[PDB]
Amino acid sequence: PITGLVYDQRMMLHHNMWDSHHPELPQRISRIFSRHEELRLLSRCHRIPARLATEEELALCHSSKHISIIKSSEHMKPRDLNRLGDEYNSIFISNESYTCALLAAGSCFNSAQAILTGQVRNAVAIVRPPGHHAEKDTACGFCFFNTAALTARYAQSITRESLRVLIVDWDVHHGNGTQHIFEEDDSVLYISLHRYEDGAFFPNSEDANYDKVGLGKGRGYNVNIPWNGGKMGDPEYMAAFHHLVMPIAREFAPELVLVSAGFDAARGDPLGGFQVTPEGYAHLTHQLMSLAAGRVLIILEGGYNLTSISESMSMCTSMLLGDSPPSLTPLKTSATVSINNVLRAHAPFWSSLR
Ligand SMILES: CC(C)S(=O)(=O)N(Cc1ccc(C(=O)NO)cc1)Cc1cccnc1
Ligand SMILES: [K+]
Ligand SMILES: [K+]
Numbered sequence: 221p222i223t224g225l226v227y228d229q230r231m232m233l234h235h236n237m238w239d240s241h242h243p244e245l246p247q248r249i250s251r252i253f254s255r256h257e258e259l260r261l262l263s264r265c266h267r268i269p270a271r272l273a274t275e276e277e278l279a280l281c282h283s284s285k286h287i288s289i290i291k292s293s294e295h296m297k298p299r300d301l302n303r304l305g306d307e308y309n310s311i312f313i314s315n316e317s318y319t320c321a322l323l324a325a326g327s328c329f330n331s332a333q334a335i336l337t338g339q340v341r342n343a344v345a346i347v348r349p350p351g352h353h354a355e356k357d358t359a360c361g362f363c364f365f366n367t368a369a370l371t372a373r374y375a376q377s378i379t380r381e382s383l384r385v386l387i388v389d390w391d392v393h394h395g396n397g398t399q400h401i402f403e404e405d406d407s408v409l410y411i412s413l414h415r416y417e418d419g420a421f422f423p424n425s426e427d428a429n430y431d432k433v434g435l436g437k438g439r440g441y442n443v444n445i446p447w448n449g450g451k452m453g454d455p456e457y458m459a460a461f462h463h464l465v466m467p468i469a470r471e472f473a474p475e476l477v478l479v480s481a482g483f484d485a486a487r488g489d490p491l492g493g494f495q496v497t498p499e500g501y502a503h504l505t506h507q508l509m510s511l512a513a514g515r516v517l518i519i520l521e522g523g524y525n526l527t528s529i530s531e532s533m534s535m536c537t538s539m540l541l542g543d544s545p546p547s548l549t550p551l552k553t554s555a556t557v558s559i560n561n562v563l564r565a566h567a568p569f570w571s572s573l574r
């Protein structure tokens with residue numbers, strides 16, 4: 221049983237020319253990589269090479285217009301970059317951004333390919349910029365292309381169209397792009413846990429509420445677990461996994477699991493306001509490893525405390541490598557309210573919840 225790891229320092233080249241201390245820092249990925257070396261986890265993994273996604277691969281999820289405009293930013297002047305970035309919600313762009321986004325996606329494709337051809341059992345992808353806010357037609361929230369959604373379609377392209385892919389998104393933010401890309405799709409089950417605050421928390425849309433269950437043939441295949449009123453942490457995430465994520469996932473029986481693994485719900489994050497611990501993330505990973513015969517790919521999304529994300533992701537990798545889960549406040553009442561609302565919304569579609 222081999223664990224893959226992909227990391228390429230040149231994904232650090234994407235940078236914010238106007239605000240060099242912007243939290244989506246180049247050093248997010250180098251710090252996570254360094255922590256893996258420091259804990260002697262890196263030598264335990266098989267290194268999977270990074271590569272650039274192709275434009276044809278991007279078209280698995282994105283429109284030609286969106287691909288073309290982001291592609292053009294490689295040769296734009298500073299004023300062009302500033303004006304283009306300001307067309308989107310929370311985007312900065314440098315001449316290196318497009319290539320870095322291609323590298324993030326291609327890294328994840330090579331990891332999925334290694335899992336699906338049996339070269340490795342599981343894998344971790346230390347990549348930036350993130351992806352889960354990117355839509356078919358637009359960039360958003362530090363994300364240019366939807367790396368995880370692309371990886372799910374890439375996986376289908378090298379196996380069969382109907383390959384069952386579970387995406388668990390534990391970034392503190394709702395993956396609006398991933399939900400929308402697969403909203404009418406029953407072959408990809410999207411489960412997101414996120415700070416919601418009745419629609420007041422970024423990305424500020426009631427699309428993230430529990431009553432959005434999917435559309436068309438995707439009804440039931442979109443599971444939003446939204447948190448309101450409380451600094452959620454390990455007890456709340458474990459409860460959501462016990463009552464919702466794991467029962468639904470087991471019934472879906474995925475053949476591949478992708479984790480949109482932001483670490484912005486971590487204790488110490490400057491934006492998320494939550495308190496999931498590294499041991500908490502380790503337990504969530506270990507639970508997911510019971511699915512899909514262990515074929516799990518962990519993809520970095522957000523997370524902005526360099527120390528917290530490095531400790532948290534490296535512990536997930538420890539779990540992928542087969543290490544025993546480390547040992548873990550009273551459950552917050554508000555979290556149980558959210559869990560019960562999701563249970564009511566999804567009981568029609570999942571017998572394991574009845
Ligand atoms: C408006 C900006 C100054 S902002 O930086 O504060 N911000 C933009 C932002 C977008 C996406 C992510 C992410 O991690 N997605 O997965 C993080 C931040 C709004 C905000 C605020 C408070 C908590 N969360 C998001
Ligand atoms: K999420
Ligand atoms: K779906």
Ligand SMILES: [Zn+2]
Pocket residue numbers: 391392393482484521522523
């Ligand atoms: Zn986030």
